[PDB]
Amino acid sequence: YERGPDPTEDSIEAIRGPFSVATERVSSFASGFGGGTIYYPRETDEGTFGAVAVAPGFTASQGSMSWYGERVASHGFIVFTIDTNTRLDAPGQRGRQLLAALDYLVERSDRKVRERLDPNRLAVMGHAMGGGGSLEATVMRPSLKASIPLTPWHLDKTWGQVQVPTFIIGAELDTIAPVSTHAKPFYESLPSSLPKAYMELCGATHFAPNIPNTTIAKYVISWLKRFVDEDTRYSQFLCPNPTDRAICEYRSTCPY
Ligand SMILES: O=C(O)c1ccc(P(=O)(O)OCCOCc2ccccc2)cc1
Ligand SMILES: [Ca+2]
Numbered sequence: 001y002e003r004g005p006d007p008t009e010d011s012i013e014a015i016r017g018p019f020s021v022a023t024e025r026v027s028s029f030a031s032g033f034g035g036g037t038i039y040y041p042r043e044t045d046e047g048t049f050g051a052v053a054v055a056p057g058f059t060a061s062q063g064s065m066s067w068y069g070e071r072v073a074s075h076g077f078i079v080f081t082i083d084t085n086t087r088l089d090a091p092g093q094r095g096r097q098l099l100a101a102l103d104y105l106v107e108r109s110d111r112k113v114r115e116r117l118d119p120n121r122l123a124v125m126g127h128a129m130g131g132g133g134s135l136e137a138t139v140m141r142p143s144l145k146a147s148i149p150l151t152p153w154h155l156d157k158t159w160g161q162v163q164v165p166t167f168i169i170g171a172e173l174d175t176i177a178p179v180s181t182h183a184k185p186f187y188e189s190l191p192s193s194l195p196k197a198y199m200e201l202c203g204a205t206h207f208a209p210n211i212p213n214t215t216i217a218k219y220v221i222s223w224l225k226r227f228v229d230e231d232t233r234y235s236q237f238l239c240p241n242p243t244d245r246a247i248c249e250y251r252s253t254c255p256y
Contacts, residue, residue: 051080162190
């Protein structure tokens with residue numbers, strides 16, 4: 001499941017990975033969700049790849065997450081920035097629609113996408129209410145390999161039944177889904193035996209995940225490599241806790 005050459009901190013911080021990405025547009029009339037764009041590596045010689053499904057926040061679309069497409073997928077992943085059914089979907093519905101996008105990748109995706117996909121190594125990512133929907137899709141399908149809630153928003157504060165390795169990225173100055181009442185109590189109610197981490201960004205707002213951010217990208221790549229690819233070549237950056245300057249607080253259940 002290991003793809004690409006051995007990583008240094010300069011390769012994870014790279015804006016482009018060792019693979020050339022291609023895309024495939026998915027209609028909004030696909031069952032269960034509002035469609036999106038499927039970013040996938042072109043070179044099929046290193047084998048098949050795992051996949052992640054990315055959800056945008058409340059009253060937002062995949063354009064708010066588009067920069068995760070070619071970025072992560074060039075490091076060796078299938079990335080699916082999806083649109084929801086309506087722009088007002090609650091976090092619970094964004095969980096379902098995250099799973100209907102993954103199922104679409106397995107059961108209905110184009111042949112070029114189907115051939116490069118390992119349908120057993122799947123994951124979810126999401127921003128704001130898409131991060132709450134990231135937490136729900138874990139509860140809804142415990143077979144998922146990774147879960148990455150970006151500045152997540154949810155009314156439910158306790159998430160002790162989650163079994164997926166979850167990486168909650170926080171934003172210091174977020175006042176829409178503030179970390180003290182959302183991102184932190186979400187992480188602390190995750191099971192202490194779960195492989196998990198909490199990264200809070202200094203001076204960041206609710207919308208920091210919507211523009212390219214080397215701090216966000218380098219450890220989303222490490223997290224998706226470690227748990228979707230079972231790639232222990234990326235534990236060096238996760239354990240012990242990263243000590244970057246753009247990070248104001250880091251918490252984790254290291255080592256893993
Ligand atoms: O009180 C409420 O009604 C309420 C509703 C929704 C939220 P949420 O945290 O989901 O906001 C989504 C932010 O992301 C969407 C976005 C992405 C990129 C650019 C601009 C906007 C919080 C409170
Ligand atoms: Ca639809």
